[PDB]
Amino acid sequence: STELTVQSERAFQKQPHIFTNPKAKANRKTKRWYKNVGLGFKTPKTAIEGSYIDKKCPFTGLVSIRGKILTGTVVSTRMHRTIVIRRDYLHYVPKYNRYEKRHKNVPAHVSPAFRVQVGDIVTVGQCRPISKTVRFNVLKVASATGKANKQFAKF
Amino acid sequence: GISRDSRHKRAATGAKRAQFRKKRKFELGRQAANTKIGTKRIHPVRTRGGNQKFRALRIETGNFSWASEGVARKTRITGVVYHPSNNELVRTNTLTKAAIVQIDATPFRQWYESHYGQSLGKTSKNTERKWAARAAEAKIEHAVDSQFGAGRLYAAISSRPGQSGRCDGYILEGEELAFYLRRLTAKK
Amino acid sequence: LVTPQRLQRKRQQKSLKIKNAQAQREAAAEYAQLLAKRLSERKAEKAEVRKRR
Amino acid sequence: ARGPKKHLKRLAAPHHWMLDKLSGCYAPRPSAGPHKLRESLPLIVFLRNRLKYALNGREVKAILMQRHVKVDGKVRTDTTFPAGFMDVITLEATNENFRLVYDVKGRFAVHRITDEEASYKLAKVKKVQLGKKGIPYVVTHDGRTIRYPDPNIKVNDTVKVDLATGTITDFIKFDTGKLVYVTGGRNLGRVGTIVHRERHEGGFDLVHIKDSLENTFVTRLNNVFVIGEPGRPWISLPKGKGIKLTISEERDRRRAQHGL
RNA sequence: AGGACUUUUACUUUGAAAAAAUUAGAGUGUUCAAAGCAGGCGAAAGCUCGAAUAUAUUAGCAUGGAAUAAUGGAAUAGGACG
RNA sequence: GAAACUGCGAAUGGCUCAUUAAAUCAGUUAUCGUUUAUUUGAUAGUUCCUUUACUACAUGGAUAUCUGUGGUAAUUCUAGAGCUAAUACAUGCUUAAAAUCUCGACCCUUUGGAAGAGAUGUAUUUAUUAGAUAAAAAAUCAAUGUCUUCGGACUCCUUGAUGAUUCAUAAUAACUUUUCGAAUCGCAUGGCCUUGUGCUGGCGAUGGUUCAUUCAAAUUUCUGCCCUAUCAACUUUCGAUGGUAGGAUAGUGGCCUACCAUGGUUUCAACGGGUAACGGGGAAUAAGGGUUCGAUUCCGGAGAGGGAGCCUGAGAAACGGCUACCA
Ligand SMILES: [Mg+2]
Ligand SMILES: [Mg+2]
Ligand SMILES: [Mg+2]
Ligand SMILES: [Mg+2]
Ligand SMILES: [Mg+2]
Ligand SMILES: [Mg+2]
Ligand SMILES: [Mg+2]
Ligand SMILES: [Mg+2]
Ligand SMILES: [Mg+2]
Ligand SMILES: [Mg+2]
Ligand SMILES: [Mg+2]
Ligand SMILES: [Mg+2]
Ligand SMILES: [Mg+2]
Ligand SMILES: [Mg+2]
Ligand SMILES: [Mg+2]
Ligand SMILES: [Mg+2]
Ligand SMILES: [Mg+2]
Ligand SMILES: [Mg+2]
Ligand SMILES: [Mg+2]
């Protein structure tokens, strides 16, 4: 779901105010800026050496992670550059002393540095309002597959 | 009267929210500046908490910066050639942020001449020794020399004339220019 | 109208400005000397650490 | 409400001003000043209620106007000045000096304290920043912005303002095993020693405090104010020294110390 | 106090929090009480103890426990260590 | 000491519950996503621009109040004339030194190194740089810097905060229909004698840029709402979900626009309908579990006949403020 071209749209895609000097003869790939979101969260090497842009990247973009940290399960990875996470919980009805299974759908913005798919449990972090509904940035794909790490059977 | 609150929008689910708390003053939105070229005419607007804002409609000259050697000069904007949002602004010569314009480019030219003196487009001993110590490091790339011979520089504006009132930006240079000229050749 | 009290006020403003500038520069110099002293102390400590190790 | 609010109804006043719920519809709203109004103490409350030197509003106004009150070496002629925690109130008449420290019930108790130490004040460091032209500065809890501080003074620390010049006299570094005061919540007025300060990556530092009676509790770091070294407080602690005797122990104190 | 890996929960103990008024409840002869946060004691010559506590059963934060209840490891070894 | 100009509040308070069912609100977070009069603490020499000719012992014009002439049937209706002031409106002066950048009347054969000239406060806007940091030694090539006791040694490099930043801050180039940098008041009027109105000089009051603090204001995370399926699919051409760029915003944000993607919610009850529903702290009731109520003494929200629109300010979509339509 990611275009091969590093910039695909009409506007140019650059990290604002990080400049690579063309007159210089170092001729490294580019000058890519990055940061660590803290909380003992490892920045992915796919973001470290990657070539995407993703204005709203917790690791490379301007957005900062602060506030709530929510763990959930991916219910929809199939809309562009964003994720829909199913968070399940038990509401405690006290008149019966009984619990009640309930679910909420939290939109978030997964960076291209992560490879997500339906069913992955994801640790996500609070940030600024990114869109009308997304307020969280995907920070870790804990379960990449879960039960699909081993697929084939060849003794 | 143009509100920017979220109440008039439908909910994430899609329900039509009922009207509530008729829109306030801390939620207002003002008219677009849709600036033009020529006969500088900046109108002050008194916004929230004082803080004079400046609408910069009809702006002709502004500061522009060169990143390679890092030098800024006041120069004239001469039309807009590309806009990443809407080509309608390009046809109407509406100047907003991130628009791509042409530059008279003379001030950069004789700054280069008094700085390196390579005679693009085709003394005291102190200046001669400065140039000798420079030792022709001014190996600036070929396309900028091409439009120097043409005489009009390709620049991308970076200031917001709608808010700041200025007309500041930077010249396209390096792969930047590359990208956009492809787009321009798409237009051509 | 020109009044000796007005000239007194003008002189007081000028003298207060000059005195405040002098005091600010003196404080800046003292803070710089304090920074130099602290830097010398920790540089001596670093040299001792390098020698011992 | 469209704009700021300038009225404080009596029931909405903090329960540490602890006024009478009758005999008045409103309560003195503290004007803007060095302290949060929820945490501060208006001068009218301190004089009319705590000291009873006055009788009502007009008397407090007359007291403040003739410049007998001196808050931290300054006159402060406004009725609802937020004289907050650790501020010094000087009355040249009766030559008396007060320092506002919470009694362990958690209230701004009347603390008559000596003239010699009244020259200075203590303060908690809430910020250490670099202002324009590269000048370091420190913001205390009073909002005092002290310029050119000691280079190794950090946040959450404590410092000793001379209160005359308003500069840096001495400071105490926040770390384990240090005498400390509590300035909010259930542990108001409590005084102890810092046993441990659990970091809690991501926010809301907590510190464990053990007092002289060997009781232990835990409090937020925003809520904490280092006051000195164990056995050597830098100020004169109020009567009781904030041990928080149990209600049964308080009853035993009432029974034992009793003469009529 | 620093890199390092952290199976994840549900549950439960403790604490910080849940504004005051209200409910509970301590002290107190408003003449008793509803109440109120007062008052008491000197020789009458200024000296004083107060304005206590608990609960809120959900959501969030920290913390100790590991029975009960659920999920995950190593089966193509692409497993663990040196 | 009337009146009036100026300044400030009039956006607090008081009343009502009509609208509103993830709406308000409660508990709990966030603003490294923003504005903030006031209060409190600090905060600026440069306004000179070629300085060998300027008001700084004080720059200009109006203008209310008032004196007189009216108009209308009347309204906190005011037109004409004549003076007059400011912390109102406009201008504008000093005033140091230092250091850093840039440009050179020359020489003397390199290690080239130097007479000298202009700018640099802050404010705004844009580019770029610094804003470090896990730990012992090398060779080499180039570039070429100090000292050389002419072997060569380079030994010394300064760096704040958070969990995190493009943060705080600093620096270069520039930019501005060029913001501020006291032409303001009260009391006491001391000291030096350069004994003159000379030189200085205290305590305050108002202002005033920026940064904090406080009163806040806006948004904002998780969870929690009454009845109803005789409401099962709802939303998107007119923004519905997301992407990007721009505009607007004080600021994030489909908040709006342009072009794309076709998405988002739902049997864990979405959407629709009803509420003689403002939410809550709480009230009645009481073995325990609960049921009903909460328009109203406190906290929030909304409203001023229903609707929209807006000036002034720090703060209003104000209504004991205006504009228009409807009644
Ligand atoms: Mg009100
Ligand atoms: Mg309560
Ligand atoms: Mg009772
Ligand atoms: Mg409904
Ligand atoms: Mg940088
Ligand atoms: Mg910055
Ligand atoms: Mg945008
Ligand atoms: Mg109703
Ligand atoms: Mg109610
Ligand atoms: Mg109700
Ligand atoms: Mg009703
Ligand atoms: Mg109310
Ligand atoms: Mg209203
Ligand atoms: Mg009516
Ligand atoms: Mg105002
Ligand atoms: Mg209205
Ligand atoms: Mg009315
Ligand atoms: Mg009103
Ligand atoms: Mg009116």
Swiss-Prot record, chain C:
Source domain of life: Eukaryota
Record note on modification: Phosphorylated.
Coiled coil: none
Family statement drawn from the similarity comment of this UniProt entry: Belongs to the eukaryotic ribosomal protein eS6 family.
The protein, known as: Small ribosomal subunit protein eS6
